[PDB]
Amino acid sequence: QTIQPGTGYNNGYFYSYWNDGHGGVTYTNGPGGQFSVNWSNSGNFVGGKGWQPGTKNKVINFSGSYNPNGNSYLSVYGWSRNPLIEYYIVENFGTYNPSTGATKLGEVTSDGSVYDIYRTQRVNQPSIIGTATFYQYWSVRRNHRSSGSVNTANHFNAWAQQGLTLGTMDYQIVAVEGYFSSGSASITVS
Ligand SMILES: O=C(O)c1cccc(C(=O)O)n1
Ligand SMILES: O=C(O)c1cccc(C(=O)O)n1
Ligand SMILES: O=C(O)c1cccc(C(=O)O)n1
Ligand SMILES: [Eu+2]
Ligand SMILES: [Eu+2]
Ligand SMILES: [Eu+2]
Numbered sequence: 001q002t003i004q005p006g007t008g009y010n011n012g013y014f015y016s017y018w019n020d021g022h023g024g025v026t027y028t029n030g031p032g033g034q035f036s037v038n039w040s041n042s043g044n045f046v047g048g049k050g051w052q053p054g055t056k057n058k059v060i061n062f063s064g065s066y067n068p069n070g071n072s073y074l075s076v077y078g079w080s081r082n083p084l085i086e087y088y089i090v091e092n093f094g095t096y097n098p099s100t101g102a103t104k105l106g107e108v109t110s111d112g113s114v115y116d117i118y119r120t121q122r123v124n125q126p127s128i129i130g131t132a133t134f135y136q137y138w139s140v141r142r143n144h145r146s147s148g149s150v151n152t153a154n155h156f157n158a159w160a161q162q163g164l165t166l167g168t169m170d171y172q173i174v175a176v177e178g179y180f181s182s183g184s185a186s187i188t189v190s
C-alpha cells in the first residue's frame with residue numbers, strides 16, 4: 001500500500017522506506033517482492049525490499065522499470081555491524097555517479113559488466129545504529145540496467161581483496177534512492 005516511512009515485512013520480504021522530510025515521494029509496497037516509488041522535487045530518500053538480515057552469498061534478482069529524472073540510484077543496498085559499513089552494488093543511476101570525487105580502488109566483473117570499486121566515508125551521519133562515522137563501499141556497474149541478477153559474493157570478495165571487509169550483516173535490499181530529484185520506479189525483488 002502507500003505507506004509513510006518505516007521498516008517492516010510485506011509479503012515475505014523486508015522493506016525499508018526512509019525520507020528526509022522534504023515530501024514529494026510516494027512509496028508503495030506491492031505483491032510479492034514488488035515495490036514502487038514515484039517522486040517529484042524530493043529531498044533524499046531510500047526505499048526498497050529484500051531481507052533482514054542479508055547474507056554474504058545471496059544471488060539477488062530484480063526486474064521492472066527505473067526512470068529517474070536527476071540524481072538517483074538503483075542498487076543492492078545494505079549494512080553490516082562490527083564493522084559498521086553501508087554498501088552499494090549500483091546497477092543503474094541518474095545524472096550523478098555516486099563515485100564522483102571518490103578514489104577508485106579497483107574493478108570487478110560480474111553478471112555481464114565491469115564494476116568500479118570505491119570507498120567513501122560518512123562522518124557523524126545517521127546509520128542503523130544512530131549517529132556515526134563509517135565507511136561506504138561501492139561497486140558501480142558500467143553497463144546500466146534495470147533488470148538482472150546480482151551475485152553479491154563476487155562484489156564482497158573483490159572488496160575484501162581491496163581491504164574492504166564486512167561485519168555481521170544487517171539488512172540487504174534492492175533500493176531506489178533519490179537526492180533532490182524526480183522519477184518513477186517499479187521493481188520486483190526475488
Ligand atoms: O500524510 C503524509 O504526509 C503522507 C502520507 C502517505 C505517505 C507519506 C510519505 O511518504 O511521506 N506521507
Ligand atoms: O510520516 C510522514 O508523513 C513522514 C515522515 C518522514 C518524512 C516525510 C516526508 O518527507 O513527507 N513524511
Ligand atoms: O508533513 C508531511 O509529512 C508532509 C507535508 C506535505 C507533503 C507531504 C508528502 O509528500 O508526504 N508530507
Ligand atoms: Eu509525508
Ligand atoms: Eu572484457
Ligand atoms: Eu533518523
